[PDB]
Amino acid sequence: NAMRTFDLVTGESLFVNDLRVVRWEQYGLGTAMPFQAMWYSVPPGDESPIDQHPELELSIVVAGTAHVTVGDTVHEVPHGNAFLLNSLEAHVVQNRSADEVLTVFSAYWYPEAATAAAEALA
C-alpha cells in the first residue's frame, strides 16, 4: 500500500470524439484523494466539445500545447504549464499543433469538497 504507479498508456480509455480519455475511476482509489482525475489527449488540429461543470478543474499539460478558450478569451498553455478553471466556466480545449499530440492531466473537485477540506485544517 506504500506507492502506486499510474500509466497513461496502459490504463483503460474511452473516446470523446477523437480525444482519448483515461478516467481514474478505473483505479478504485475511493476517497483517498479529495478529487477525481483523468488524462486526456487531443489529436493535432482537434478540440474538445465544449465543457461546463460545477467542479473546479486544475489541468497540467504533460505534452504538446493547449489553447484554452474560456468565455471570450483564448489562453495558451505550453508543456509544463497549468491552468485552473473556476466553477461552471464553459471551456473548450484546442490542439493547434499540426503534428504534436496534446496530453493533459486534470484533477477536478466540487467547491464543497474544497471548503470542507480546509475547515478540517482549522
Which residues form the interface with a second copy (CB under 8 A)? Answer: 1-9, 29-35, 37, 39, 56, 58, 60-63, 68, 70-71, 73, 75, 77, 79-86, 89, 91, 103, 105, 107, 109-110, 112-121
Q: Which residues have a Cβ under 8 Å from the Cβ of 91 and sit 6 or more positions away?
A: 50, 51, 52, 57, 68, 69, 70, 85
Pairwise CA distance, residues 85 & 6, whole Å: 24
Q: Which three cell numbers stand for residue 72?
A: 471570450
Taking the complex as a whole, the smallest distance from the CB of residue 48 to Ni ion amounts, in Å, to 8
Binding site for Ni ion (CB under 5 A): 51, 57
For Ni ion, the closer of residues 50 and 117 by Cβ is: 50
Residue 91 CB, nearest distance to Ni ion (Å)? Answer: 6
Residue 51: which of a second copy, Ni ion, none does it interact with, CB under 5 to 8 A by kind?
Answer: Ni ion
Minimum CB separation of residue 99 from Ni ion in Å reads: 25
Three cell numbers, residue 2: 506504500
- Report d(CA 22, CA 13) in Å as an integer: 4
